[PDB]
Protein backbone atom coordinates (compact mmCIF):
# COMPACT_ATOMS: atom_id res chain seq x y z
CA UNK A 1 0.00 0.00 0.00
CA UNK A 2 0.91 3.61 -0.55
CA UNK A 3 -0.71 4.21 2.84
CA UNK A 4 2.26 2.52 4.51
CA UNK A 5 4.41 5.28 3.00
CA UNK A 6 2.71 7.81 5.32
CA UNK A 7 2.98 6.19 8.78
CA UNK A 8 5.68 8.60 9.98
CA UNK A 9 6.87 12.13 9.22
CA UNK A 10 7.50 12.57 5.47
CA UNK A 11 9.64 15.37 3.97
CA UNK A 12 7.76 17.52 1.47
CA UNK A 13 9.15 19.41 -1.51
CA UNK A 14 7.01 21.80 -3.62
CA UNK A 15 8.13 23.32 -6.92
CA UNK A 16 5.89 25.71 -8.86
CA UNK A 17 6.55 27.23 -12.27
CA UNK A 18 4.14 30.09 -12.87
CA UNK A 19 3.13 32.59 -15.54
CA UNK A 20 0.30 35.08 -14.89
CA UNK A 21 -0.43 37.62 -17.64
CA UNK A 22 3.14 37.08 -18.79
CA UNK A 23 4.51 37.77 -15.30
CA UNK A 24 6.72 34.72 -14.81
CA UNK A 25 7.84 33.46 -11.43
CA UNK A 26 8.93 30.43 -9.45
CA UNK A 27 7.99 29.22 -5.96
CA UNK A 28 9.84 26.61 -3.91
CA UNK A 29 8.47 25.03 -0.74
CA UNK A 30 9.85 22.62 1.79
CA UNK A 31 8.76 21.15 5.07
CA UNK A 32 7.12 17.99 6.32
CA UNK A 33 3.83 16.21 6.74
CA UNK A 34 2.34 13.83 9.30
CA UNK A 35 -0.63 12.04 7.78
CA UNK A 36 -1.31 10.25 11.08
CA UNK A 37 -2.47 13.52 12.63
CA UNK A 38 -3.07 15.39 9.38
CA UNK A 39 -0.42 18.05 10.02
CA UNK A 40 1.55 20.01 7.37
CA UNK A 41 4.35 22.51 7.98
CA UNK A 42 5.83 24.27 4.95
CA UNK A 43 7.80 27.39 4.09
CA UNK A 44 7.47 28.80 0.57
CA UNK A 45 9.82 31.27 -1.11
CA UNK A 46 9.35 33.18 -4.35
CA UNK A 47 12.77 32.43 -5.79
CA UNK A 48 12.53 34.92 -8.67
CA UNK A 49 11.89 38.12 -6.72
CA UNK A 50 8.56 39.60 -5.63
CA UNK A 51 5.55 37.30 -6.08
CA UNK A 52 3.33 38.90 -8.78
CA UNK A 53 0.10 37.51 -7.21
CA UNK A 54 -0.94 37.37 -3.52
CA UNK A 55 0.34 34.40 -1.52
CA UNK A 56 -3.15 33.32 -0.34
CA UNK A 57 -4.23 32.76 -3.94
CA UNK A 58 -1.62 29.98 -4.30
CA UNK A 59 -2.41 28.02 -1.11
CA UNK A 60 -4.71 25.48 -2.74
CA UNK A 61 -2.22 24.92 -5.57
CA UNK A 62 0.84 24.47 -3.33
CA UNK A 63 -0.91 17.53 -1.14
CA UNK A 64 -4.21 15.99 -0.01
CA UNK A 65 -2.35 12.71 0.51
CA UNK A 66 -1.42 14.08 3.95
CA UNK A 67 -5.02 14.37 5.08
CA UNK A 68 -5.83 12.34 8.17
CA UNK A 69 -8.12 9.53 7.03
CA UNK A 70 -9.55 7.82 10.13
CA UNK A 71 -9.28 4.07 9.84
CA UNK A 72 -13.01 3.59 9.18
CA UNK A 73 -12.20 5.41 5.90
CA UNK A 74 -8.74 4.19 5.27
CA UNK A 75 -10.13 2.48 2.23
CA UNK A 76 -11.50 5.63 0.74
CA UNK A 77 -8.03 7.25 0.50
CA UNK A 78 -7.35 7.59 -3.22
CA UNK A 79 -4.43 9.96 -2.65
CA UNK A 80 -2.22 7.63 -0.61
CA UNK A 81 -3.25 4.59 -2.65
CA UNK A 82 -1.75 6.11 -5.82
CA UNK A 83 1.71 6.33 -4.11
CA UNK A 84 4.59 5.98 -4.77
CA UNK A 85 3.90 6.45 -8.49
CA UNK A 86 1.61 9.37 -7.65
CA UNK A 87 -1.25 11.25 -9.23
CA UNK A 88 -1.85 14.18 -11.55
CA UNK A 89 -3.80 17.10 -10.04
CA UNK A 90 -5.49 19.52 -12.44
CA UNK A 91 -7.48 22.64 -11.52
CA UNK A 92 -9.04 25.70 -13.06
CA UNK A 93 -9.53 28.52 -10.56
CA UNK A 94 -11.81 31.35 -11.71
CA UNK A 95 -11.36 34.65 -9.87
CA UNK A 96 -14.67 36.51 -9.92
CA UNK A 97 -14.56 39.63 -12.09
CA UNK A 98 -10.91 38.80 -12.90
CA UNK A 99 -8.71 36.19 -14.57
CA UNK A 100 -8.21 32.47 -14.00
CA UNK A 101 -5.42 30.07 -13.06
CA UNK A 102 -5.03 26.72 -14.77
CA UNK A 103 -2.78 24.34 -12.81
CA UNK A 104 -1.26 20.96 -13.61
CA UNK A 105 0.65 19.15 -10.90
CA UNK A 106 2.19 15.74 -10.33
CA UNK A 107 2.37 14.53 -6.73
CA UNK A 108 4.66 11.56 -6.19
CA UNK A 109 7.49 10.12 -4.17
CA UNK A 110 11.06 10.87 -5.17
CA UNK A 111 13.20 8.76 -2.88
CA UNK A 112 11.59 9.23 0.53
CA UNK A 113 10.40 12.76 -0.31
CA UNK A 114 6.82 13.57 -1.32
CA UNK A 115 7.15 16.03 -4.23
CA UNK A 116 4.40 18.32 -5.55
CA UNK A 117 5.56 19.79 -8.89
CA UNK A 118 3.26 22.37 -10.47
CA UNK A 119 2.84 24.31 -13.69
CA UNK A 120 0.54 27.35 -13.35
CA UNK A 121 -0.77 29.52 -16.19
CA UNK A 122 -2.92 32.55 -15.42
CA UNK A 123 -4.64 34.69 -18.07
CA UNK A 124 -7.20 37.48 -18.35
CA UNK A 125 -6.16 39.28 -15.17
CA UNK A 126 -6.59 42.99 -14.58
CA UNK A 127 -3.30 44.79 -13.89
CA UNK A 128 -5.04 46.87 -11.19
CA UNK A 129 -7.31 44.06 -10.03
CA UNK A 130 -7.28 42.43 -6.61
CA UNK A 131 -4.74 39.81 -7.74
CA UNK A 132 -2.12 41.55 -9.90
CA UNK A 133 -2.58 44.67 -7.78
CA UNK A 134 -1.98 42.81 -4.49
CA UNK A 135 -5.18 43.95 -2.78
CA UNK A 136 -5.85 40.75 -0.78
CA UNK A 137 -5.32 40.39 2.96
CA UNK A 138 -2.59 38.02 4.15
CA UNK A 139 -4.89 35.50 5.85
CA UNK A 140 -7.01 32.53 4.81
CA UNK A 141 -10.62 31.30 4.85
CA UNK A 142 -10.55 27.54 4.48
CA UNK A 143 -13.34 25.60 2.81
CA UNK A 144 -14.40 21.95 2.93
CA UNK A 145 -13.68 19.89 -0.19
CA UNK A 146 -16.28 17.33 -1.23
CA UNK A 147 -14.37 14.47 -2.89
CA UNK A 148 -16.30 12.44 -5.48
CA UNK A 149 -15.01 9.36 -7.27
CA UNK A 150 -14.64 9.76 -11.03
CA UNK A 151 -14.78 6.12 -12.13
CA UNK A 152 -14.39 7.23 -15.76
CA UNK A 153 -10.89 8.69 -15.34
CA UNK A 154 -10.14 6.31 -12.42
CA UNK A 155 -9.60 9.20 -10.04
CA UNK A 156 -11.52 11.87 -8.16
CA UNK A 157 -13.06 15.26 -8.74
CA UNK A 158 -14.18 18.14 -6.57
CA UNK A 159 -15.30 21.72 -6.98
CA UNK A 160 -15.46 24.32 -4.24
CA UNK A 161 -15.29 28.05 -3.52
CA UNK A 162 -12.47 29.84 -1.69
CA UNK A 163 -13.08 33.34 -0.30
CA UNK A 164 -10.19 35.84 -0.15
CA UNK A 165 -10.60 38.93 2.04
CA UNK A 166 -10.13 42.16 0.07
CA UNK A 167 -8.19 44.92 1.78
CA UNK A 168 -10.66 47.64 1.82
CA UNK A 169 -13.70 45.60 1.98
CA UNK A 170 -15.50 42.56 0.89
CA UNK A 171 -14.48 39.26 -0.45
CA UNK A 172 -12.82 37.95 -3.63
CA UNK A 173 -14.23 34.62 -4.82
CA UNK A 174 -11.94 31.90 -6.23
CA UNK A 175 -14.04 29.19 -7.88
CA UNK A 176 -12.07 25.91 -7.87
CA UNK A 177 -12.61 22.95 -10.19
CA UNK A 178 -10.42 19.90 -9.63
CA UNK A 179 -9.73 16.47 -11.08
CA UNK A 180 -7.13 13.90 -10.03
CA UNK A 181 -5.92 10.87 -11.99
CA UNK A 182 -3.36 8.21 -11.03
CA UNK A 183 -0.04 8.23 -12.84
CA UNK A 184 0.69 4.53 -12.48
CA UNK A 185 -1.26 1.55 -13.75
CA UNK A 186 -1.66 -0.31 -10.45
CA UNK A 187 -5.03 -0.45 -8.73
CA UNK A 188 -6.42 2.62 -7.02
CA UNK A 189 -9.06 3.14 -4.33
CA UNK A 190 -12.07 5.05 -5.65
CA UNK A 191 -13.79 6.65 -2.66
CA UNK A 192 -17.37 7.05 -1.75
CA UNK A 193 -18.26 10.72 -1.48
CA UNK A 194 -16.65 12.30 1.59
CA UNK A 195 -15.18 15.54 2.92
CA UNK A 196 -11.72 16.95 3.50
CA UNK A 197 -11.69 19.59 6.24
CA UNK A 198 -8.69 21.93 6.38
CA UNK A 199 -7.40 24.59 8.79
CA UNK A 200 -4.66 26.83 7.39
CA UNK A 201 -2.55 29.44 9.19
CA UNK A 202 -0.26 31.79 7.24
CA UNK A 203 2.64 33.62 8.87
CA UNK A 204 6.03 35.20 8.20
CA UNK A 205 9.54 34.21 9.22
CA UNK A 206 11.07 37.32 10.90
CA UNK A 207 14.55 36.36 9.69
CA UNK A 208 13.56 35.78 6.04
CA UNK A 209 14.26 38.71 3.71
CA UNK A 210 12.86 37.04 0.62
CA UNK A 211 9.20 37.14 -0.37
CA UNK A 212 7.76 34.12 1.39
CA UNK A 213 4.89 32.28 3.11
CA UNK A 214 5.07 30.08 6.19
CA UNK A 215 2.07 27.74 6.17
CA UNK A 216 0.74 25.48 8.91
CA UNK A 217 -2.15 23.19 8.07
CA UNK A 218 -4.32 20.58 9.78
CA UNK A 219 -6.57 18.36 7.68
CA UNK A 220 -8.83 15.37 8.25
CA UNK A 221 -11.14 13.31 6.08
CA UNK A 222 -14.73 12.78 7.18
CA UNK A 223 -17.74 10.82 5.99
CA UNK A 224 -21.31 11.70 4.98
Curated annotation (Swiss-Prot):
InterPro entries in the record: GFP, GFP-related, Green_fluorescent_prot
Annotated effect of mutating residue 98 to E: In mut1.27; shifts fluorescence lifetime from 3.03 to 2.85 ns
Effect of residue 198 to Y: Gives rise to yellow-emission variants. In EYFP; leads to yellow fluorescence, folds faster and more efficiently at 37 degrees Celsius and has superior solubility and brightness
Effect of residue 63 to L: In EYFP; leads to yellow fluorescence, folds faster and more efficiently at 37 degrees Celsius and has superior solubility and brightness
Outcome (variant: residue 193 to S): In EBFP1.2; shifts the excitation and emission spectra to shorter wavelengths and increases quantum yields compared to BFP
BP GO terms, sorted: bioluminescence; generation of precursor metabolites and energy
Effect of residue 150 to V: In EBFP2.0; shifts the excitation and emission spectra to shorter wavelengths and increases quantum yields compared to BFP
Effect ascribed to mutating residue 171 to A: In mut2.1; shifts fluorescence lifetime from 3.03 to 2.50 ns
Superkingdom field: Eukaryota
Tissue spec. comment: Photocytes.
Phenotype upon changing residue 162 to V: In P9; increases fluorescence at 475 nm excitation. In R10-3; matures to the red-emitting state with excitation and emission maxima at 555 and 585 nm, respectively
Effect in UniProt of substituting residue 193 to I: In mut2.1; shifts fluorescence lifetime from 3.03 to 2.50 ns
Gene3D superfamilies: Green fluorescent protein
Outcome when changing residue 157 to Q: In R10-3; matures to the red-emitting state with excitation and emission maxima at 555 and 585 nm, respectively
Keywords: Chromophore, Luminescence, Photoprotein
Effect seen on changing residue 145 to I: In Azurite; shifts the excitation and emission spectra to shorter wavelengths and increases quantum yields compared to BFP
A Pfam short name: GFP
Application notes: Green fluorescent protein has been engineered to produce a vast number of variously colored mutants, fusion proteins, and biosensors. Further generation of mutants led to more stable proteins (at 37 degrees Celsius for example) with brighter fluorescence and longer fluorescence lifetimes.
Effect annotated for changing residue 67 to A: Increases fluorescence at warmer temperatures such as 37 degrees Celsius. In GFPmut 3; highly fluorescent mutant when excited at 488 nm
Subunit structure: Monomer.
Family as reported in the entry's similarity comment: Belongs to the GFP family.
Free-text function comment from the UniProt entry: Energy-transfer acceptor. Its role is to transduce the blue chemiluminescence of the protein aequorin into green fluorescent light by energy transfer. Fluoresces in vivo upon receiving energy from the Ca(2+)-activated photoprotein aequorin.
Protein name per Swiss-Prot or TrEMBL: Green fluorescent protein
Amino acid sequence: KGEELFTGVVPILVELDGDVNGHKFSVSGEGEGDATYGKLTLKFICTTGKLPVPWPTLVTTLVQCFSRYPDHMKRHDFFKSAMPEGYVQERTIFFKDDGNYKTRAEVKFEGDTLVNRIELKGIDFKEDGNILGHKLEYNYNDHQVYIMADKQKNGIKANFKIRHNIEDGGVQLADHYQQNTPIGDGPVLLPDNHYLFTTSTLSKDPNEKRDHMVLLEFVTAAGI
